[PDB]
Design a protein around this ligand. Structure first.
Ligand SMILES: Nc1nc2c(ncn2[C@@H]2O[C@H](COP(=O)(O)OP(=O)(O)O)[C@@H](O)[C@H]2O)c(=O)[nH]1
Length: 192
């Protein structure tokens, strides 16, 4: 799948993961809203009464062309509140890099912790640990008044300081493309 000879594309999958309502859809809508019509496909949203998923692909202008191959990024997330683990497990199939979108709200601090234990455990299903996959932490919602300090959030999701961290206010685009740029850098660094 990653190499498509017929279209001369290399495909990478980036998953936005994190607790429900932390800003993953918003990140996806902002990125989509900025790509030119000729460089992206359809945004696809799947929903049963109980589960959800959301994705689209696009050709980032910022990446160069090896041997005539353009790069194509496929962005995925499970949006909304989760009732079943199934679509989280499946969203990680063939993942190349991960953006963890943590929430700043004080009453969402455990949810951040829980969501990261859950991702670690979903990775494990595929034989992957947190070291095997580029992970970027986005600490979203820097604007809300009682917003916890970045290091307190980072303390519960990445207690060893192993992952790049970035601030965002995704409703306004701040941090959104820096975060994507950071996870991409990591993904491409592995292919060299
Ligand atoms: N105050 C604030 N609200 C945000 C931010 N990002 C997203 N939201 C809001 O949080 C709610 C849930 O966001 P959404 O992206 O759907 O979360 P998802 O379930 O993780 O996809 C929505 O009403 C968003 O507008 C932010 O940076 N600051």
């Amino acid at each position: 799948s990653t190499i498509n000879f017929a279209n001369r594309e290399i495909n990478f999958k980036i998953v936005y993961y994190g607790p429900g309502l932390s800003g993953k859809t918003t990140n996806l809508k902002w990125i989509y809203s900025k790509v030119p019509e000729g460089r992206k496909g359809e945004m696809v949203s799947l929903a049963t009464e109980d589960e959800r998923t959301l994705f689209f692909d696009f050709l980032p202008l910022d990446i160069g062309e090896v041997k005539g191959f353009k790069t194509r990024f496929h962005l995925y997330t499970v949006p909304g509140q989760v009732f079943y683990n199934a679509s989280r497990k499946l969203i990680l199939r063939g993942v190349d890099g991960i953006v963890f979108v943590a929430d700043s709200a004080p009453n969402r601090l455990r949810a951040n912790a829980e969501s990261m234990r859950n991702m670690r455990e979903n990775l494990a299903e595929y034989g992957l640990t947190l070291d095997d996959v580029p992970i970027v932490i986005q600490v979203n919602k820097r604007d809300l008044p009682d917003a916890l300090p970045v290091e307190m959030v980072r303390a519960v999701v990445d207690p060893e300081g192993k992952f790049p961290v970035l601030e965002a206010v995704a409703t306004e685009g701040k941090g959104v493309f820096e975060t994507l740029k950071e996870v991409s850098r990591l993904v491409l660094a592995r292919v060299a």
